[PDB]
From Swiss-Prot, chains A, B, C, D, E:
Catalyses which reaction(s): ATP + H2O + a folded polypeptide = ADP + phosphate + an unfolded polypeptide
Protein's gene: HSPD1
GO cellular component: cell surface; clathrin-coated pit; coated vesicle; cytoplasm; cytosol; early endosome; extracellular exosome; extracellular space
Keywords, alphabetical: Acetylation, ATP-binding, Chaperone, Disease variant, Hereditary spastic paraplegia, Host-virus interaction, Isomerase, Isopeptide bond, Leukodystrophy, Mitochondrion, Neurodegeneration, Nucleotide-binding, Phosphoprotein, Transit peptide, Ubl conjugation
Quaternary structure annotation from Swiss-Prot or TrEMBL: Homoheptamer arranged in a ring structure. The functional units of these chaperonins consist of heptameric rings of the large subunit Hsp60, which function as a back-to-back double ring. Interacts with 2 heptameric Hsp10 rings to form the symmetrical football complex. Interacts with HRAS. Interacts with ATAD3A. Interacts with ETFBKMT and EEF1AKMT3. Interacts with MFHAS1. (Microbial infection) Interacts with hepatitis B virus/HBV protein X.
EC number: 5.6.1.7
PANTHER family per the UniProt record, alphabetical: 60 KDA HEAT SHOCK PROTEIN, MITOCHONDRIAL
Binding site for ATP: K51, D87, G88, T89, T90, T91, G231, D311
Organism for this UniProt entry: Homo sapiens (Human)
Modified residues (N6-acetyllysine): K51, K58, K63, K67, K101, K106, K109, K132, K167, K178, K181, K260, K272
Gene Ontology BP, a term: isotype switching to IgG isotypes
Residues where Phosphotyrosine is found: Y66
Full protein name: 60 kDa heat shock protein, mitochondrial
Length: 342, 342, 342, 342, 342
């Protein structure tokens, strides 16, 4: 029997979107090889340093309960992505924000948001089918090293260590990670491989451990499903698969167009983090052949297959699906009910 | 034991009607195939998204106690409808709001509210009788699939899986709904039928669980009693039977007119949620034959039975019965006693 | 479920830097033979007077959480330095302040802070390599007395008693120091050598105990690893190594220049605390021969090894490594999450 | 005598850039043929509806004195542009905001804002010289008709009436526009051409008054100096001029690149107000043939001069000059002194 | 009459020094060829942008009366410098600030601030005697051009035009400056020469004519008395004249030391504003040859008289005298009384 506050329509949608945008910015700053970090205040002592997107998402709550609803929903998106794969939480968050934003923009009296959500789901199914079609399997230790290096912010040593551990204990053997008291990283087997991470301080060790865990999750996903073009170009090459779709009604077309517009968000964010204009980069990615992407680290155009800029199919698929499933549902909102602050 | 504030007559009635209007609008935004959802903040964790009238009604409260009284009465309407039939709580809420508003409008110095209550109960019994008269028994599993699809907001897969479970376990069997961890809905029998609803997150799986529970309850009511016209056309065709009823006095005439103008509310709300004027649609429905109605999804006029838009008799009869039984009693209030805030 | 406030980019960086500056000044008013002490209030009783960097660092906590974050990070620098070397906490803190300040100064839209951090790590690795190259082993108890006297703020009796105790018990023996109930320091062996610290009050004996503990830790570090030029001249002589580095991209250039400009900080601050202009002293140190440094106590440019102004190699390398590892990580921060002050 | 408030560096820089951003955004929303109207409340009577850049600029005032400083500087830019040409105040506003932002971004400890301003002046001189070099004189009444129509938000009747007035009075004749009292425009000469605006209310008449005055000033400037490519394409085609410039040192290069990025702002803003992305439109204009630009109404790429989209050379050159001269001076600011509000 | 507030000694000195330092920094930020401009809010209209020291000095008033006292005293320094020479107001500002600081620190219970002032006066008269014995008469129109260029922020056109005007109307002839209407400045004689300063907006012509006025005053002083080394170098070179002085008492020695340390402040400030450190640069200037000075524009050491960076003897000597006379008297203050704010 607690007093509640009721908001209708556009005010509620805008108040959701404010929190969604705040959390999505705070997460998306940590995207890509040029991405930066986030300092999170800790109550029990030293603040923690995390480039990990889902930690940034889960570490943010907003006083306004209306904005807190959207913040907690994008937090749920990121948490589901982490629970399913363990990487690409930033990509899932930016996709969720973009889908929710485009859904809120195209809301009117005549627009049926439920059929828009149905169209979003249909387009997501089609693009996941295209993703599985385009993916290729892993057949080389060099590919494992590349996956672990790209997943760990370009740390060649971490990629080499993970590749060595996978070679030593097999691609299915158990590997864990724990902090080492040394200044460098060492691998020992006593089998089951255990990775000991070195660093000059607890915060640096924690950050490197997060990167190592991300790389390990990505390489396990790669061996489980396969790899696709990295740098967000997998979505940018699956985009034509939506043009072959024939929507049933208008709202289906609205959903398909919204998903097609959101497909280029990850490449836009990756380019934007590297001090350049995202839209031109996405345009040139699409104009290029099916084997050319933008190397965000070096700031030029290369062949991603040769350069080792690749990502697992599982990460991108789960990120896109988890973002769509929650963002489209939030789009169907008309009334929000929050508890009055006491 | 505590100080109480007392209000007399019209001001108190308006104060209660304010809360009834707030709750009724916040629930009626979720009526019809083109209806939308309501976001409800949950203290322990992720906010929930629902398209169910009873939960939205139960998840609201107001600081003002005079409004909260009407809010609690209409909450009782929705809860009793859900407990008795498991479906049609939003229709119960809108009928309760309509009856309460009409009763409050037609109160004068000489008008006896109790005899208006007697007249409205007489009219409700009459329309229940004619609703039973125009009922149709369920004889094919195709009608089962149609009822399940209609009750689940135009979901073909939910209706098909409900029909398959109905065919396998038997019409009078036992069905239990549990949330599956997969991305697809699965049916298993081990026999007791079990539906494993699937989704990519907790909010989607909870919403789909609500929809499948509504479909199950609607189909069970259909097999128990029968089916009548969908889209609010059952009451809309029971309307012309009130002209055959004569009141004993003027108050019963007022109550009969209250039911007469109330029976149009579900169709008007269904049309209005589709972004169109309800009144013209309802007038064309009356002008049309005894079988033609308005399909709110396709936005045209079709033979309701042949297009599968059908509805259980029990749901409508109990929703109208309970909404009347509570709102009419709310009409007869003159003095209201509420506690002083502490 | 606690609400947080998010600050982006330059404002958050400046807010952290203000707290870093406050704590670093409060710590850096101490180091050098002419440095001053700090009075820290003790709630349970008499206050404490200390000339030790880590005590000042730990004892200082700020109100605003954005300043408190930088305060806790420089606290981590000081504590890690104290735990790994037992000396040079003030040097580590001033190096952390300088690295963080310079890195924040060079943060731009077109800059990649992660590659700046990589360049910083390469520069500190080269510097520590040259520092190890320039180390000298300990062969005489005279060098032991010199190290003890230098790390005891020029107290000759402490150095003499430490050298005599290490002569009696051995250079790898077990020495512990405790308070003395007489008016002077006395050494007793029973075996494990025990030092009793004399004084007329709790504050005097506590400060002398801290100084003699610093002397013991520095002397043990010297006997384990070696000694180098004191007065910060080790890093000044290590400066030329960085000029031979040929990094890859501009961000590594920036990081290497950060380290090169940070190497001058200890000598500059030691000179500044003496009452003279630090920059002129440090420049005259660079121009002079490899064996000539500035005697802050005497205010003259003298032979460092002949005068006996020497410091352990392990202490200097530990301080520099910890300061780099923490401050450079703090450099790469753009988004900051802090709890609301409930 | 009056107590003053002083701020240093980046804090005040961001403070007045906030006001510059606010005023320039309010001005820019009205740019292009798809720009909208700004409603300004009037103390005397009915609020006015305006599409005029300098009017909105002068109508923007802020309580914050630091933001008000930048607001009044951009007001000064718009006012000087209106005084010297009477058209293109929106272009001057957006160019000035772009230059102020770019100058504020690229300020460091060693950066020299004054020499950056000198380089901005050098680039401005080069762009103005190339505007003169590519300028084409007006030879037929169709061209002045097109210029009047384009400057009148594509009002064909306004341009036709102005062309008739010009052909009846002459290229150098005196034309004045006065308030009209009927519903249709009428041109009469009693000599001096006088135009009466046809409107239905005061505010509509004022809006068309602004439009017709802008069109008349556009015709006067076009016949004074000449015509170049419209739609902001002149600066895009003049961009290659800066490629041949050799800066004296780094600061002039910074200014040259600031102007180079700024030269794309008008076309980008015209595209953005059309509802599409501006960067890709600008890039397509730059890649495509020099004689083909972007049309905002049809949203396609056609020949600008053949389609009538042309601008007076005087208008664009004075907009660029007035914007740059004050924005680059705003860049040089380091300390800001304001009065304490009282 | 009205109630007063009285403060004794050190706290009052610190409060005054706070405002002195604030205004001194706000003035000295502009100093040097690489200095930046100050924005001062104007209540009557457009804000002003200036690079002149005395305008910023006059335009700053402080809420605290104790700080305002020192602010007004250094304002007196600036105004006296402007009224006597019209140039070098920032030099006098920084000299007075340094003298105030060094007199505020070097005061003890047994010291005699009156005798300290007398020693300061003796040092200053010796310094001005050395300056007059180190001057060189202007015997070349090219020298006039160099002086005009250097005193006008190194603008070649302004210096050349001033040289041409002085050649046309005679060295002692009258020159007047007024703002023009076109974009470039012109000189005309009808004799009396009028310099029509050109520009784009009000702020540009205002600060341009301020710079031209400063250059004209410097030129007049150069013709009247002579020229000396620029960049504060002559004050550096006159320090050895102080070393020959034997103070009568200890406090005269204190004052001589104060002036001796102060004599380096202008060069330090010029170097500091140039993005480089100042102490080592001025030390290298003292070490280098007599004619060698630091060219802060090119960032190197050159024979400065040959490069044309020259300053008038009268400007330098008057600035130093006006700074010293006020500051050495200010340091003598022990008790300050103020009015109670109301
Ligand atoms: N040098 C590079 N050039 C282009 N794309 C790159 C480069 N390095 C990494 N990427 C891509 O950028 C993304 C890496 O982003 P990032 O590591 O910040 O977050 P994430 O993978 O979404 O997940 P998480 O937030 O959990 O780390 C991946 O899609 C990866 O393929
Ligand atoms: N496609 C359709 N066109 C027209 N009317 C429809 C259509 N589908 C369902 N209806 C009608 O709309 C109503 C369904 O309302 P809704 O699904 O919002 O909830 P409800 O039946 O009131 O109850 P609950 O909220 O418990 O599910 C029924 O009267 C049904 O007959
Ligand atoms: N007499 C001296 N002359 C010159 N340099 C000295 C002298 N004594 C110490 N130093 C230098 O000062 C630094 C030592 O500083 P100090 O003893 O105050 O504390 P610390 O080692 O920085 O740390 P902590 O305060 O935790 O003990 C070293 O760089 C050392 O070489
Ligand atoms: N149909 C069009 N296609 C392309 N560019 C157009 C079109 N119509 C106008 N423009 C361009 O838009 C600009 C005109 O902007 P607008 O009419 O908003 O006012 P303005 O000239 O900027 O000045 P003010 O706001 O003071 O009237 C010019 O650069 C013109 O070339
Ligand atoms: N290019 C230069 N190289 C070296 N010193 C220079 C250079 N330009 C100017 N200076 C020195 O800097 C000072 C000139 O500073 P500035 O013109 O900003 O103000 P000012 O002389 O203090 O006074 P005012 O504000 O009245 O002009 C002089 O000491 C001059 O010698
Ligand atoms: K991330
Ligand atoms: K419903
Ligand atoms: K110390
Ligand atoms: K406009
Ligand atoms: K100046
Ligand atoms: Mg990642
Ligand atoms: Mg229902
Ligand atoms: Mg020490
Ligand atoms: Mg215009
Ligand atoms: Mg000057």
């Amino acid at each position: 029997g607690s007093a509640k506050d009721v908001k209708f329509g556009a005010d509620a949608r805008a108040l959701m979107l404010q929190g969604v945008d705040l959390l999505a910015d705070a997460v998306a700053v940590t995207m890509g090889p040029k991405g930066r970090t986030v300092i999170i205040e800790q109550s029990w002592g030293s603040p923690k340093v995390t480039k990990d997107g889902v930690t940034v998402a889960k570490s943010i709550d907003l006083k306004d309960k209306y904005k807190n609803i959207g913040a907690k929903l994008v937090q749920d998106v990121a948490n589901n992505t982490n629970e399913e794969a363990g990487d690409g939480t930033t990509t899932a968050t930016v996709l969720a924000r973009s889908i929710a934003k485009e859904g809120f923009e195209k809301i009117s009296k005549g627009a049926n948001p439920v059929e828009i959500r149905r169209g979003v789901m249909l387009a997501v199914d089609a693009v996941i089918a295209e993703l599985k079609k385009q993916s290729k399997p892993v057949t080389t230790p060099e590919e494992i090293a590349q996956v672990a290096t790209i997943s760990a912010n370009g740390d060649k040593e971490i990629g080499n260590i993970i590749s060595d551990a996978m070679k030593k204990v097999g691609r299915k053997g158990v590997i864990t990670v724990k902090d080492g008291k040394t200044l460098n990283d060492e691998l020992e087997i006593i089998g089951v491989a255990v990775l000991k991470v070195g660093g000059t301080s607890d915060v640096e060790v924690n950050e490197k451990k997060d990167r190592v865990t991300d790389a390990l999750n990505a390489t396990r996903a790669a061996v489980e499903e396969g790899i696709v073009l990295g740098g967000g170009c997998a979505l940018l090459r699956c985009i034509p698969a939506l043009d072959s779709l024939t929507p049933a009604n208008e709202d289906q077309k609205i959903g398909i167009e919204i998903i097609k517009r959101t497909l280029k968000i990850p490449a836009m964010t990756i380019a934007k983090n590297a001090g350049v204009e995202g839209s031109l980069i996405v345009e040139k990615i699409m104009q290029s052949s099916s084997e050319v992407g933008y190397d965000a680290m070096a700031g030029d155009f290369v062949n991603m297959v040769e350069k080792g800029i690749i990502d697992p199919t599982k990460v991108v698929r789960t990120a896109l699906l988890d973002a769509a499933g929650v963002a489209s549902l939030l789009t169907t909102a008309e009334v929000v009910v929050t508890e009055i602050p006491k």
